[PDB]
Every structure is written in structure tokens, then in C-alpha cells.
């Protein structure tokens, strides 16, 4: 594999509740206001991790717990997925960092089986780091009365961070599942949660989120 030019991501432990940064914001998530986002959990982006070890194994198990939780409560579920064989003119500047992108292949495009979307769940075409850019995420959420977003997926310091700060700027309170995201390293993972906590959102563990939603 070579997504993000990484043949492999070395194993690292997910942060525990005691290791989370203090959120500057007072926002707390509510079942009737929140929407779940599963950010780019496609075979292409996950190949580099050892799926039997941390962080991916527990992160995938945690997104599966959040999907089951939302499906039992009518909480809207959104996924982002890029399409393969993007034209460089549409892919833009990210191609200068991460190459031409995934191919139109069953080894790249599909959301992994363990997190497969169900009928009635929105799968948005992902064009940029932020799930809101070149999409209708904001209007889909608004007309459903959802003004809170719970972010899960990969990579924490890139698309998850860009999506959180855009949600915040669009008046959508932003939450990130600290152990239902994964990244290039624990250092990148910690950096993402620390920056979100001081500027635009609230990192919480999956166990904490399941208890309050
Ligand atoms: Cl846009
Ligand atoms: Na490999
Ligand atoms: Na609240
Ligand atoms: Na409702
Ligand atoms: Na793998
Ligand atoms: Na691999
Ligand atoms: Na838009
Ligand atoms: Na509860």
C-alpha cells in the first residue's frame, strides 16, 4: 500500500480519558442535536495500519459501537468517502502533498465491512480535508435539526481537524471521539486533540460519548 506515501503506520496506543487535553469550550453532546460522521474509513486509508493492533483495531471497534448506538436512537449517520481516479484539476493542491489519490478499485474505495453503511445513511463524496467543502453536509444536518457533530475516522490531524474547525465556524458544536480516530503517530494524534480542545471542539472517549448520548 502507499496511501499518504505511508507503506505502514507503526502501532501506537489510543489516548485514555486521563490523557485527554482539557477542552476550552463548554459544549456537551445531546442525542437530539448530534449527527455522527465516519470520516474516510476506506480500505485505501486503513491498509497502512496493522488492523489487528492499536490504534486501528480498537478505533474501528469504537466506531462500530458508536454506529450501533446511533442506529438504535435515530441519530443521523454520515460517512465521507473519496471516489477513485480523481482528475488532478478537481483534486487540487492536496495532490502536491499526497499524490494523485486512490484508484476506482475494490481494494481502495469501499468503506470497510466492519463499518459498512446501512440504508438511510448518507455517504458524502469527500473532495477536501473538511467534510463540509464542496458538499451539502451543513444543509443535510440543519434540516434534520442537528447542530452538533461527532467526528470519528482518519486522519486525526488532517481531515478530522479541518472538519472540526469548519463545523465550529458554521455554528455546529464539534466533538471528536479521541479513541475512535487514528493518525500517522501518537504525536500527530495528541497534537490534533490538543489543538481542537483549545480552538474549536471537545475531545471525549467513546465510553464517555456512549454514556451521554
Ligand atoms: Cl465549498
Ligand atoms: Na502492506
Ligand atoms: Na449541551
Ligand atoms: Na429530530
Ligand atoms: Na493493514
Ligand atoms: Na498493510
Ligand atoms: Na456547500
Ligand atoms: Na445515558
Residue numbers in the entry: -2 to 210
Report text from the authors:
Clinical and environmental isolates of Stenotrophomonas maltophilia produce an enterobactin-like siderophore that promotes bacterial growth under low-iron conditions. In bacteria producing enterobactin-related molecules, EntB and its homologs are usually multi-domain proteins in which the amino portion acts as an isochorismatase and the carboxy domain serves as an aryl carrier protein (ArCP). A crystal structure determination revealed EntB to be an unusual, single-domain form of isochorismatase enzyme.
The S. maltophilia EntB (SmEntB) structure was determined at 1.78 Å resolution. The protein core consists of a six-stranded parallel β-sheet (β3–β2–β1–β4–β5–β6). The cleft that is located between the lobe and the central core of the protein is part of the putative active site. Although a single chain is observed in the asymmetric unit, crystallographic symmetry revealed the presence of a dimer. Analytical size-exclusion chromatography estimated a molecular weight of 61.8 kDa, consistent with dimerization. The hydrophobic residues of the pocket (Leu3, Phe42, Trp95, Tyr126, Tyr1552, Ile155 and Phe181) are conserved in SmEntB and other structural homologs, suggesting that isochorismate or other vinyl ethers may fit into the active site of SmEntB.
